[PDB]
Short mmCIF file of C-alpha atoms and ligand atoms in Angstrom, two decimals:
data_model
loop_
_atom_site.label_atom_id
_atom_site.label_comp_id
_atom_site.label_asym_id
_atom_site.label_seq_id
_atom_site.Cartn_x
_atom_site.Cartn_y
_atom_site.Cartn_z
CA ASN A 422 0.00 0.00 0.00
CA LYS A 423 2.37 2.70 1.30
CA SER A 424 5.21 1.14 -0.70
CA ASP A 425 3.28 1.10 -4.00
CA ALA A 426 1.71 4.51 -3.57
CA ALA A 427 5.21 5.91 -2.86
CA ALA A 428 6.51 4.16 -6.01
CA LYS A 429 3.81 5.96 -8.10
CA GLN A 430 4.71 9.31 -6.48
CA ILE A 431 8.43 8.83 -7.32
CA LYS A 432 7.45 7.75 -10.84
CA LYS A 433 5.39 10.92 -11.30
CA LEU A 434 8.28 12.90 -9.86
CA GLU A 435 10.79 11.41 -12.28
CA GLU A 436 8.54 12.22 -15.22
CA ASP A 437 8.19 15.80 -13.99
CA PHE A 438 11.99 16.20 -13.99
CA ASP A 439 12.64 14.14 -17.13
CA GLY A 440 15.24 11.79 -15.59
CA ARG A 441 15.74 8.80 -13.26
CA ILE A 442 15.33 8.80 -9.44
CA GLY A 443 16.77 6.00 -7.30
CA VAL A 444 15.66 5.68 -3.68
CA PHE A 445 16.29 3.45 -0.73
CA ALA A 446 15.13 4.25 2.82
CA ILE A 447 15.31 2.42 6.16
CA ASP A 448 13.44 2.99 9.39
CA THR A 449 15.97 1.44 11.77
CA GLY A 450 13.41 1.27 14.59
CA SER A 451 10.62 -0.63 12.84
CA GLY A 452 12.80 -2.14 10.12
CA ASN A 453 10.48 -0.94 7.34
CA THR A 454 12.21 -0.10 4.07
CA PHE A 455 11.22 1.45 0.74
CA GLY A 456 13.11 1.07 -2.56
CA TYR A 457 12.50 2.62 -5.95
CA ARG A 458 14.94 1.58 -8.66
CA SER A 459 17.06 0.61 -5.64
CA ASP A 460 19.19 -1.94 -7.54
CA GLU A 461 19.87 0.23 -10.57
CA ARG A 462 23.30 1.80 -11.20
CA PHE A 463 23.74 5.51 -10.38
CA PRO A 464 27.00 7.60 -10.55
CA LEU A 465 28.50 8.14 -7.09
CA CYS A 466 29.80 11.63 -7.88
CA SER A 467 31.19 13.19 -4.69
CA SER A 468 28.96 11.05 -2.46
CA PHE A 469 31.67 8.41 -2.14
CA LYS A 470 33.74 10.95 -0.11
CA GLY A 471 31.57 10.15 2.92
CA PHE A 472 32.86 6.58 2.74
CA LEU A 473 36.43 7.73 2.01
CA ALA A 474 36.26 9.64 5.31
CA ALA A 475 35.08 6.48 7.07
CA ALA A 476 37.89 4.45 5.47
CA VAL A 477 40.39 6.96 6.93
CA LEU A 478 38.76 6.61 10.36
CA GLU A 479 39.02 2.81 10.23
CA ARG A 480 42.73 3.04 9.40
CA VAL A 481 43.09 5.43 12.38
CA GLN A 482 41.23 3.00 14.68
CA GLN A 483 43.55 0.18 13.51
CA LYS A 484 46.51 2.46 14.34
CA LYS A 485 47.82 2.40 10.75
CA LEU A 486 47.40 6.20 10.74
CA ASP A 487 47.32 9.06 13.28
CA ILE A 488 44.36 11.39 13.04
CA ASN A 489 46.69 14.30 13.96
CA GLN A 490 49.48 13.51 11.48
CA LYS A 491 50.35 16.46 9.20
CA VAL A 492 49.64 16.00 5.49
CA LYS A 493 51.76 18.31 3.31
CA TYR A 494 51.10 19.15 -0.35
CA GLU A 495 52.80 22.52 -0.89
CA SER A 496 53.87 21.87 -4.51
CA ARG A 497 50.65 20.16 -5.61
CA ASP A 498 48.73 21.46 -8.56
CA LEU A 499 45.44 21.39 -6.64
CA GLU A 500 42.34 19.95 -8.30
CA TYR A 501 39.38 22.11 -9.23
CA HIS A 502 36.81 22.46 -6.40
CA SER A 503 39.29 22.35 -3.54
CA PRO A 504 37.77 25.12 -1.32
CA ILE A 505 39.43 23.88 1.86
CA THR A 506 42.73 22.40 0.84
CA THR A 507 43.51 25.46 -1.33
CA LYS A 508 43.60 27.71 1.72
CA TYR A 509 45.92 25.48 3.79
CA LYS A 510 48.33 24.68 0.92
CA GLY A 511 50.99 26.73 2.74
CA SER A 512 50.97 24.86 6.05
CA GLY A 513 49.42 21.43 5.37
CA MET A 514 46.47 19.83 7.24
CA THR A 515 46.00 17.02 9.76
CA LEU A 516 44.87 13.71 8.25
CA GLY A 517 41.61 14.08 10.24
CA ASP A 518 40.89 17.58 8.91
CA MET A 519 41.63 16.56 5.33
CA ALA A 520 39.19 13.63 5.56
CA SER A 521 36.45 15.82 7.06
CA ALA A 522 37.15 18.42 4.37
CA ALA A 523 36.54 15.70 1.74
CA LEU A 524 33.29 14.87 3.54
CA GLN A 525 31.96 18.24 4.55
CA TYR A 526 32.96 20.37 1.55
CA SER A 527 33.54 17.69 -1.12
CA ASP A 528 37.13 18.93 -1.40
CA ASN A 529 38.69 17.39 -4.52
CA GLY A 530 42.34 17.96 -3.43
CA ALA A 531 41.65 16.22 -0.10
CA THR A 532 40.00 13.31 -1.89
CA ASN A 533 42.81 12.62 -4.38
CA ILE A 534 45.60 13.20 -1.84
CA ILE A 535 44.06 10.75 0.63
CA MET A 536 43.40 8.15 -2.05
CA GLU A 537 46.92 8.40 -3.40
CA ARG A 538 48.74 8.26 -0.02
CA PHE A 539 46.52 6.38 2.46
CA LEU A 540 43.77 4.35 0.76
CA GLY A 541 45.33 2.60 -2.21
CA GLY A 542 43.62 4.63 -4.96
CA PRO A 543 40.08 3.87 -6.32
CA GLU A 544 40.97 0.15 -6.12
CA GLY A 545 41.74 0.60 -2.41
CA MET A 546 38.49 2.59 -1.89
CA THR A 547 36.57 -0.23 -3.53
CA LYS A 548 38.43 -2.76 -1.34
CA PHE A 549 37.30 -0.88 1.78
CA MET A 550 33.61 -1.18 0.81
CA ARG A 551 34.08 -4.87 -0.10
CA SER A 552 35.40 -5.34 3.44
CA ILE A 553 32.16 -3.99 4.93
CA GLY A 554 30.21 -6.41 2.72
CA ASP A 555 29.23 -3.86 0.04
CA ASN A 556 29.37 -5.65 -3.32
CA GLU A 557 27.75 -3.05 -5.64
CA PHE A 558 29.97 -0.02 -4.91
CA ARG A 559 32.86 0.53 -7.34
CA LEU A 560 35.33 3.41 -7.71
CA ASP A 561 37.28 3.26 -10.97
CA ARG A 562 38.69 6.75 -11.52
CA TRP A 563 40.25 9.74 -9.72
CA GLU A 564 38.98 13.30 -9.29
CA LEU A 565 37.63 14.89 -11.43
CA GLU A 566 37.17 12.27 -14.20
CA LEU A 567 35.08 10.11 -11.86
CA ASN A 568 32.29 12.71 -12.34
CA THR A 569 31.67 12.38 -16.08
CA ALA A 570 28.38 10.50 -15.38
CA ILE A 571 27.96 9.28 -18.97
CA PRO A 572 24.71 7.27 -19.49
CA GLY A 573 25.57 3.55 -19.48
CA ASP A 574 28.96 3.94 -17.81
CA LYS A 575 29.29 1.61 -14.85
CA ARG A 576 32.55 3.18 -13.66
CA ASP A 577 32.18 5.02 -10.33
CA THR A 578 28.64 3.78 -9.58
CA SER A 579 26.65 2.04 -6.90
CA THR A 580 22.97 1.39 -6.18
CA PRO A 581 20.76 3.41 -3.75
CA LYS A 582 20.25 0.19 -1.73
CA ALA A 583 24.00 -0.48 -1.38
CA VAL A 584 24.68 3.11 -0.44
CA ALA A 585 21.89 2.97 2.17
CA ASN A 586 23.12 -0.32 3.61
CA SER A 587 26.74 0.77 3.75
CA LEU A 588 25.89 4.07 5.39
CA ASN A 589 23.81 2.22 7.97
CA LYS A 590 26.76 -0.12 8.75
CA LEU A 591 29.20 2.76 8.98
CA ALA A 592 27.25 5.50 10.82
CA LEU A 593 25.15 3.27 13.07
CA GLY A 594 26.76 -0.20 13.01
CA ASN A 595 29.99 -1.53 14.53
CA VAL A 596 32.52 -1.10 11.69
CA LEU A 597 33.85 1.89 13.65
CA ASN A 598 34.46 1.59 17.38
CA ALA A 599 32.40 3.81 19.67
CA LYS A 600 34.85 6.73 19.77
CA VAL A 601 35.58 6.85 16.06
CA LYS A 602 31.95 6.25 15.16
CA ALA A 603 31.16 9.40 17.18
CA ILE A 604 33.63 11.45 15.12
CA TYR A 605 32.20 10.08 11.86
CA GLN A 606 28.69 11.01 13.02
CA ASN A 607 29.81 14.55 13.99
CA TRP A 608 31.46 14.85 10.59
CA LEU A 609 28.22 13.88 8.83
CA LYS A 610 26.15 16.20 11.03
CA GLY A 611 28.33 19.22 10.08
CA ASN A 612 28.22 18.56 6.31
CA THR A 613 27.74 21.90 4.49
CA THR A 614 26.58 20.97 1.01
CA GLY A 615 23.22 19.32 1.70
CA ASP A 616 20.98 22.20 2.84
CA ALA A 617 18.74 21.93 -0.23
CA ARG A 618 18.41 18.11 -0.33
CA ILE A 619 17.42 15.63 2.40
CA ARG A 620 17.90 18.27 5.12
CA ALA A 621 15.10 20.30 3.46
CA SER A 622 12.73 17.29 3.65
CA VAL A 623 12.51 16.89 7.45
CA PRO A 624 11.31 18.84 10.57
CA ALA A 625 13.68 21.52 11.85
CA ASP A 626 13.94 19.56 15.14
CA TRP A 627 15.34 16.41 13.55
CA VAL A 628 19.13 16.02 13.57
CA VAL A 629 20.67 15.08 10.18
CA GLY A 630 24.09 13.92 9.01
CA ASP A 631 24.52 13.73 5.23
CA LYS A 632 26.79 13.54 2.17
CA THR A 633 25.97 14.91 -1.29
CA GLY A 634 27.28 14.49 -4.80
CA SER A 635 27.01 16.73 -7.84
CA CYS A 636 28.66 15.34 -11.01
CA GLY A 637 27.93 18.59 -12.92
CA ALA A 638 26.75 16.69 -15.97
CA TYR A 639 23.71 14.73 -17.15
CA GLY A 640 21.80 16.36 -14.26
CA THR A 641 23.43 13.81 -11.91
CA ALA A 642 23.19 14.54 -8.16
CA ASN A 643 22.60 12.63 -4.95
CA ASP A 644 22.36 12.76 -1.16
CA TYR A 645 22.48 10.14 1.54
CA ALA A 646 21.51 10.79 5.15
CA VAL A 647 21.27 9.45 8.67
CA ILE A 648 18.30 11.05 10.39
CA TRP A 649 17.63 11.23 14.16
CA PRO A 650 13.92 12.23 14.69
CA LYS A 651 13.32 13.53 18.16
CA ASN A 652 11.39 10.78 19.89
CA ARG A 653 12.41 7.81 17.69
CA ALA A 654 15.10 5.56 16.19
CA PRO A 655 17.15 6.91 13.22
CA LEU A 656 16.28 6.65 9.52
CA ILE A 657 18.62 6.05 6.57
CA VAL A 658 17.73 7.89 3.35
CA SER A 659 19.56 7.45 0.05
CA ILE A 660 18.58 9.45 -3.06
CA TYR A 661 20.37 9.31 -6.44
CA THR A 662 19.32 10.95 -9.72
CA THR A 663 20.38 11.06 -13.38
CA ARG A 664 19.05 13.00 -16.37
CA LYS A 665 19.09 12.48 -20.14
CA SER A 666 21.27 15.19 -21.75
CA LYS A 667 24.80 16.34 -20.82
CA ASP A 668 23.61 19.95 -20.38
CA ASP A 669 20.64 19.12 -18.12
CA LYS A 670 21.10 20.50 -14.63
CA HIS A 671 20.51 18.52 -11.42
CA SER A 672 17.49 19.33 -9.25
CA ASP A 673 17.85 19.91 -5.52
CA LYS A 674 14.08 20.19 -5.22
CA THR A 675 13.57 16.78 -6.84
CA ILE A 676 15.99 15.22 -4.36
CA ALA A 677 14.24 16.93 -1.47
CA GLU A 678 10.77 15.83 -2.70
CA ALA A 679 11.99 12.23 -3.32
CA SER A 680 13.25 12.20 0.28
CA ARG A 681 9.85 13.49 1.54
CA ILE A 682 8.12 10.65 -0.31
CA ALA A 683 10.59 8.02 0.90
CA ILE A 684 10.32 9.13 4.53
CA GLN A 685 6.52 8.90 4.35
CA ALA A 686 6.81 5.38 2.88
CA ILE A 687 8.77 4.06 5.89
CA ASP A 688 7.35 6.25 8.63
B1 4D6 B 693 31.51 16.16 -6.55
O1 4D6 B 693 30.86 15.46 -7.53
O2 4D6 B 693 30.47 16.48 -5.75
C1 4D6 B 693 30.51 17.58 -4.83
C2 4D6 B 693 29.08 17.47 -4.37
C3 4D6 B 693 28.39 18.54 -3.56
O3 4D6 B 693 27.16 18.73 -3.79
O4 4D6 B 693 29.07 19.14 -2.69
C4 4D6 B 693 30.84 18.85 -5.58
C5 4D6 B 693 32.22 18.69 -6.22
C6 4D6 B 693 32.32 17.44 -7.12
N1 4D6 B 693 31.91 17.83 -8.46
C7 4D6 B 693 32.72 18.57 -9.23
O5 4D6 B 693 33.94 18.58 -9.06
C8 4D6 B 693 32.03 19.56 -10.15
C9 4D6 B 693 32.58 19.85 -11.50
C10 4D6 B 693 32.41 20.96 -12.31
C11 4D6 B 693 33.08 20.84 -13.57
C12 4D6 B 693 33.73 19.65 -13.69
S1 4D6 B 693 33.53 18.72 -12.29
#
């Protein structure tokens, strides 16, 4: 009933925006879920950076890395869309800060530096997600090529379901010990790029941690979220979208509406 009525609403919404909308949502209290195109491939865009940050945290927990270690890059020709790393090029950044900059501002310099030095490249990123039991996620390329979002390209894609599951395991499960889980959660809560997406879909008194992506082509954008309603157990919301032409812009409102619909479905 709720599930099928929500499916129709998403379907109407995808027609309205002339693209594809992928949704998976979990009510972690009741266990109810809702999925719309939840096993179809969508480009990760910058949304994988949320998991990159969690991979760094796991390495810290395992004492392979120090969260406070300086990361220097004074000669680097910094990638486009590096709002945070650009400013600290002079003096370097702690490993922790660089990871949270990749998360909270989608910093491209932070992302590539971390992947080249600490994570084993896209192959290493993919290995991390394999290790949490995520079999759909794949990172093939580096910044910024990973963002091309060409229809049919399976490079740098996952499914809404897998993203939902993996976020649940990482933010709420026991991949990260208690202490490092708390840091991850605080990182997600202070994300800056998601004001117009899932954060716009919920009451002002709910607490949200999220991670967005915006490929900047083929109207491809996404958001995933952990949501703490006031009186209840948390929700997991995962929204991914694509569009038909290269020049088509993404739609924050469509992502926010899709979230609204998904939350209703599981509520
Ligand atoms: B990434 O895909 O996602 C970030 C997501 C967000 O909403 O914060 C933004 C930066 C990344 N995308 C790009 O680098 C944008 C580009 C513009 C021209 C080529 S890539």
